[PDB]
């Protein structure tokens, strides 16, 4: 395992343009296009960040490339925020993966809000933060896919995958 298969599995891969678990047009594996409710402004997107014009659909290369892309961008984003940064380089690799998984899925900002998990994480505080993380919208409305994330930063191992 590593955040790759990881955010894979979590992600799944789709080709065509969808609409993510809070509806929002996204493609690929979990690329996010645009929050707005046009298709055309989502298949503006894809087409700017493709560099071609795509219909809505791309192909398996394409998809790996953007993800490649958002998790260079999430994991830069963390090092570059002033909040998350010496809790991320606080932690083992793999519970690193857990907080570029949260990141990607919640952005930057969201994840940084997290004030009092993020305290018991760098206090090493595991079962503790665990409780604590499922204490938000976040496990509510993907609570499957957060319990998974949740296990990996209080066990630091890859049991949940």
């Given at each position: 395992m590593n955040i790759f298969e990881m955010l894979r599995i979590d992600e799944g891969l789709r080709l065509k343009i969808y609409k993510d678990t809070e509806g929002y047009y996204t493609i690929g594996?979990?690329?996010?296009?645009?929050?707005?409710?046009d298709l055309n402004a989502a298949k503006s997107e894809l087409d700017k960040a493709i560099g071609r014009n795509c219909n809505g659909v791309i192909t398996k290369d394409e998809a790996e490339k953007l993800f490649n892309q958002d998790v260079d961008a999430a994991v830069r984003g963390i090092l570059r925020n002033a909040k998350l940064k010496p809790v991320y380089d606080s932690l083992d690799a793999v519970r690193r993966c857990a907080a570029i998984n949260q990141v990607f899925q919640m952005g930057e900002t969201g994840v940084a809000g997290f004030t009092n998990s993020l305290r018991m994480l760098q206090q090493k505080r595991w079962d503790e933060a665990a409780v604590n993380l499922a204490k938000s919208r976040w496990y509510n409305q993907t609570p499957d896919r957060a319990k998974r994330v949740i296990t990996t930063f209080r066990t630091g191992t890859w049991d949940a995958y």
């Open positions: 594996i979990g690329h996010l296009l645009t929050k707005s409710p």
